[PDB]
Scaffold this motif. Structure first.
Motif, PDB file in Angstrom:
ATOM      1  N   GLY A   8       0.805  -1.190  -0.038  1.00 35.29           N
ATOM      2  CA  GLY A   8      -0.075  -0.060  -0.076  1.00 35.29           C
ATOM      3  C   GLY A   8       0.798   1.359   0.115  1.00 35.29           C
ATOM      4  O   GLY A   8       2.055   1.365   0.393  1.00 35.29           O
ATOM      5  N   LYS A   9       0.174   2.495  -0.482  1.00 34.32           N
ATOM      6  CA  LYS A   9       0.788   3.884  -0.376  1.00 34.32           C
ATOM      7  C   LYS A   9       0.592   4.415   0.841  1.00 34.32           C
ATOM      8  O   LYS A   9      -0.071   4.387   1.670  1.00 34.32           O
ATOM      9  CB  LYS A   9       0.245   4.524  -1.677  1.00 34.32           C
ATOM     10  N   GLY A  10       1.847   4.917   1.351  1.00 32.26           N
ATOM     11  CA  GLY A  10       1.728   6.023   2.470  1.00 32.26           C
ATOM     12  C   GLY A  10       2.040   7.330   2.307  1.00 32.26           C
ATOM     13  O   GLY A  10       2.301   7.626   1.252  1.00 32.26           O
ATOM     14  N   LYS A  11       1.871   8.047   3.383  1.00 34.27           N
ATOM     15  CA  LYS A  11       1.749   9.328   3.173  1.00 34.27           C
ATOM     16  C   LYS A  11       3.396   9.935   3.041  1.00 34.27           C
ATOM     17  O   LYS A  11       3.670  10.864   2.377  1.00 34.27           O
ATOM     18  CB  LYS A  11       1.378  10.130   4.538  1.00 34.27           C
ATOM     19  N   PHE A  12       4.317   9.030   3.712  1.00 33.22           N
ATOM     20  CA  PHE A  12       5.622   9.445   3.562  1.00 33.22           C
ATOM     21  C   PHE A  12       6.813   8.427   2.932  1.00 33.22           C
ATOM     22  O   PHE A  12       7.940   8.295   2.934  1.00 33.22           O
ATOM     23  CB  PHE A  12       6.415   9.776   5.000  1.00 33.22           C
ATOM     24  N   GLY A  13       6.073   7.466   2.200  1.00 32.22           N
ATOM     25  CA  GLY A  13       6.515   6.450   1.507  1.00 32.22           C
ATOM     26  C   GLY A  13       5.728   5.098   1.223  1.00 32.22           C
ATOM     27  O   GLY A  13       4.797   5.434   0.566  1.00 32.22           O
TER      28      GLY A  13
ATOM     29  N   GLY B 101      -5.583  -7.711   4.489  1.00 33.19           N
ATOM     30  CA  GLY B 101      -5.638  -6.653   4.038  1.00 33.19           C
ATOM     31  C   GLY B 101      -6.439  -5.345   4.836  1.00 33.19           C
ATOM     32  O   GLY B 101      -6.517  -5.865   6.141  1.00 33.19           O
ATOM     33  N   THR B 102      -7.116  -4.529   4.279  1.00 34.09           N
ATOM     34  CA  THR B 102      -7.663  -3.541   4.970  1.00 34.09           C
ATOM     35  C   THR B 102      -9.148  -3.646   5.036  1.00 34.09           C
ATOM     36  O   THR B 102      -9.976  -4.186   4.089  1.00 34.09           O
ATOM     37  CB  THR B 102      -7.429  -2.019   4.565  1.00 34.09           C
ATOM     38  N   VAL B 103      -9.761  -3.380   6.108  1.00 33.38           N
ATOM     39  CA  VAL B 103     -11.343  -3.112   6.179  1.00 33.38           C
ATOM     40  C   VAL B 103     -11.580  -1.968   5.254  1.00 33.38           C
ATOM     41  O   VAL B 103     -12.707  -2.599   4.533  1.00 33.38           O
ATOM     42  CB  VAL B 103     -11.497  -2.642   7.842  1.00 33.38           C
TER      43      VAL B 103
ATOM     44  N   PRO C 190     -10.771   3.079   8.336  1.00 34.07           N
ATOM     45  CA  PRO C 190     -10.872   1.954   7.626  1.00 34.07           C
ATOM     46  C   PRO C 190      -9.492   1.465   6.979  1.00 34.07           C
ATOM     47  O   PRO C 190      -9.061   0.061   7.357  1.00 34.07           O
ATOM     48  CB  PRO C 190     -12.044   1.901   6.409  1.00 34.07           C
ATOM     49  N   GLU C 191      -8.795   2.454   6.566  1.00 31.90           N
ATOM     50  CA  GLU C 191      -7.411   2.005   5.761  1.00 31.90           C
ATOM     51  C   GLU C 191      -6.411   1.572   6.858  1.00 31.90           C
ATOM     52  O   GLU C 191      -5.417   1.350   6.400  1.00 31.90           O
ATOM     53  CB  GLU C 191      -7.123   3.258   4.997  1.00 31.90           C
ATOM     54  N   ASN C 192      -6.785   2.071   8.212  1.00 35.63           N
ATOM     55  CA  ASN C 192      -5.768   1.612   9.028  1.00 35.63           C
ATOM     56  C   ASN C 192      -6.081   0.439  10.055  1.00 35.63           C
ATOM     57  O   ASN C 192      -5.572   0.181  11.102  1.00 35.63           O
ATOM     58  CB  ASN C 192      -5.412   2.788  10.200  1.00 35.63           C
TER      59      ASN C 192
ATOM     60  N   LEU D 273       6.709  -4.507  10.393  1.00 37.50           N
ATOM     61  CA  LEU D 273       5.668  -4.633  10.949  1.00 37.50           C
ATOM     62  C   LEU D 273       5.126  -6.335  10.809  1.00 37.50           C
ATOM     63  O   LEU D 273       5.488  -6.784   9.596  1.00 37.50           O
ATOM     64  CB  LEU D 273       4.598  -3.767  10.340  1.00 37.50           C
ATOM     65  N   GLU D 274       4.120  -6.588  11.651  1.00 36.79           N
ATOM     66  CA  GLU D 274       3.323  -8.009  11.421  1.00 36.79           C
ATOM     67  C   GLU D 274       2.565  -7.611  10.154  1.00 36.79           C
ATOM     68  O   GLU D 274       2.088  -6.745   9.874  1.00 36.79           O
ATOM     69  CB  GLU D 274       2.509  -8.014  12.697  1.00 36.79           C
ATOM     70  N   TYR D 275       2.702  -8.668   9.212  1.00 35.72           N
ATOM     71  CA  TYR D 275       1.923  -8.686   7.897  1.00 35.72           C
ATOM     72  C   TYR D 275       0.362  -9.152   8.278  1.00 35.72           C
ATOM     73  O   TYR D 275       0.232 -10.122   8.821  1.00 35.72           O
ATOM     74  CB  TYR D 275       2.616  -9.635   7.071  1.00 35.72           C
TER      75      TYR D 275
HETATM   76  N1  LIG Z   1       1.181  -4.787   8.166  1.00 36.95           N
HETATM   77  C1  LIG Z   1       0.538  -4.594   6.725  1.00 36.95           C
HETATM   78  N2  LIG Z   1       0.080  -5.713   6.219  1.00 36.95           N
HETATM   79  C2  LIG Z   1      -0.861  -5.335   4.998  1.00 36.95           C
HETATM   80  N3  LIG Z   1      -0.832  -4.331   4.589  1.00 36.95           N
HETATM   81  C3  LIG Z   1      -0.548  -3.215   5.329  1.00 36.95           C
HETATM   82  C4  LIG Z   1       0.111  -3.205   6.568  1.00 36.95           C
HETATM   83  N4  LIG Z   1       0.775  -2.040   6.947  1.00 36.95           N
HETATM   84  C5  LIG Z   1       0.279  -1.369   6.065  1.00 36.95           C
HETATM   85  N5  LIG Z   1      -0.536  -1.970   5.006  1.00 36.95           N
HETATM   86  C6  LIG Z   1      -0.862  -1.162   3.919  1.00 36.95           C
HETATM   87  O1  LIG Z   1      -0.381   0.012   3.558  1.00 36.95           O
HETATM   88  C7  LIG Z   1      -1.326   0.954   3.728  1.00 36.95           C
HETATM   89  C8  LIG Z   1      -0.222   2.167   4.462  1.00 36.95           C
HETATM   90  O2  LIG Z   1       0.091   1.719   5.700  1.00 36.95           O
HETATM   91  P1  LIG Z   1       0.123   2.673   6.908  1.00 36.95           P
HETATM   92  O3  LIG Z   1       0.916   2.145   8.087  1.00 36.95           O
HETATM   93  O4  LIG Z   1      -1.271   3.028   7.086  1.00 36.95           O
HETATM   94  O5  LIG Z   1       0.856   4.291   6.495  1.00 36.95           O
HETATM   95  P2  LIG Z   1       0.520   5.641   6.603  1.00 36.95           P
HETATM   96  O6  LIG Z   1       0.938   6.240   7.813  1.00 36.95           O
HETATM   97  O7  LIG Z   1       1.141   6.543   5.555  1.00 36.95           O
HETATM   98  O8  LIG Z   1      -0.785   6.052   6.258  1.00 36.95           O
HETATM   99  C9  LIG Z   1      -2.216   0.461   4.665  1.00 36.95           C
HETATM  100  O9  LIG Z   1      -3.390   1.373   4.755  1.00 36.95           O
HETATM  101  C10 LIG Z   1      -2.376  -0.626   4.061  1.00 36.95           C
HETATM  102  O10 LIG Z   1      -3.409  -0.574   2.915  1.00 36.95           O
END
Ligand SMILES: Nc1ncnc2c1ncn2[C@@H]1O[C@H](COP(=O)(O)OP(=O)(O)O)[C@@H](O)[C@H]1O
Ligand SMILES: Cc1c(C(=O)NS(=O)(=O)N(C)C)cc(-c2ccc(Cl)cc2)c2cc[nH]c12
Ligand SMILES: O=C(O)[C@@H]1CCCC[C@H]1C(=O)O
Ligand SMILES: [Mg+2]
Ligand SMILES: [Mg+2]
Length: 258
Positions: free
Chosen positions: A14-19, A90-92, A133-135, A84-86
């Motif tokens: 997934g796409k993050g705010k800082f990577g 996925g996401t809700v 939901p994305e978290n 992180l734990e995988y």
């Molecule tokens: N441990 C994980 N397992 C599976 N998907 C993940 C995991 N961590 C993050 N993701 C995916 O990557 C996205 C970004 O992760 P996140 O920690 O929320 O970054 P940010 O702080 O940039 O929002 C999540 O919304 C999800 O889609």
């Protein structure tokens, strides 16, 4: 301890705010995990380098089955890597996008999982502040896992995406505590049942007003018990929102969970 050379990298998760977040495997043990990669230049430009230390220190000390594990971190000349734990299902966020809405049983089971993880957090004066939901990640058995402790702090705090899940006190820039997560839980319950958050709008401006005024309505299919729990969580006054023990004993929760 760890370095990039210790992991084989896979597809992005997934796409993050800082990577970006990547699937990865630890070479020696064969441990599959998620590697949250952040660019130093971007963190520095936004001035969030110490808050990243906060995400790490807070998440690394939480041990609960409904909270995503953070195993450690490492960094190089240009990036910070969070181990992180995988969460394999996925996401809700994605489940909601494909199912449109959740039934009362699925919603109330998720609320119970969230309340239990939040009760644990708040017991250490930890405020998540970014429950959305994305978290909210899903384990191998489909169990909910609270993730992304990026904006996490200890309560009380007055410290500075969409505003959809944030309570009026944080939107105004005022003092706040554990009650911010009770508001977010209310916004989540509504979203799970309805398919969209209660203050959703076209602009950040329109959404700000809706939260400030507590301006929301329920579709007719939302049950009396669901309206009760939601309406109670969505109080403009943090003091008036219930405890998590009260959410867990709500008749609607007990009748539909788990
Ligand atoms: N441990 C994980 N397992 C599976 N998907 C993940 C995991 N961590 C993050 N993701 C995916 O990557 C996205 C970004 O992760 P996140 O920690 O929320 O970054 P940010 O702080 O940039 O929002 C999540 O919304 C999800 O889609
Ligand atoms: C430059 C730098 C360092 C750092 O100390 N780097 S270093 O002088 O050892 N060097 C190799 C460049 C460390 C971090 C950092 C922030 C948070 C965590 Cl959890 C871990 C590392 C960040 C975040 C943005 N810029 C950073
Ligand atoms: O882990 C992160 O991407 C960031 C670290 C610094 C604070 C903000 C945070 C985030 O967007 O969740
Ligand atoms: Mg996130
Ligand atoms: Mg985050």
């Amino acid at each position: 301890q760890w370095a990039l050379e210790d992991f084989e990298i896979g597809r992005p998760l997934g796409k993050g705010k800082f990577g970006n977040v990547y699937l990865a495997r630890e070479k020696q043990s064969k441990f599959i995990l998620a590697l949250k990669v952040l660019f130093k230049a971007q963190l520095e430009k936004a001035g969030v380098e110490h808050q990243l230390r906060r995400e790490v220190e807070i998440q690394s000390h939480l041990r609960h089955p409904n909270i995503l594990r953070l195993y450690g971190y490492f960094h190089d000349a240009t990036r910070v890597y969070l181990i992180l734990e995988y969460a394999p299902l996925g996401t809700v966020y994605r489940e909601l996008q494909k199912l449109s809405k959740f039934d009362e049983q699925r919603t109330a089971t998720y609320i119970t999982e969230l309340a239990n993880a939040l009760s644990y957090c708040h017991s250490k004066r930890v405020i998540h502040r970014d429950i959305k939901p994305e978290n909210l990640l899903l384990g191998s058995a489909g169990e909910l896992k609270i993730a992304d402790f990026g904006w996490s702090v200890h309560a009380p705090s007055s410290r500075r995406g969409t505003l959809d899940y944030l309570p009026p006190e944080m939107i105004e820039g005022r003092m706040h505590d554990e009650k911010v997560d009770l508001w977010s839980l209310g916004v989540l319950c509504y979203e799970f049942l309805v398919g969209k958050p209660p203050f959703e709008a076209n602009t950040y401006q329109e959404t700000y007003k809706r939260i400030s005024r507590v301006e929301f309505t329920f579709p007719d299919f939302v049950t009396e018990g669901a309206r009760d729990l939601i309406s109670r969580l969505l109080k403009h006054n943090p003091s008036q929102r219930p405890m998590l023990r009260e959410v867990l004993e709500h008749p609607w929760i007990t009748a539909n969970s788990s």
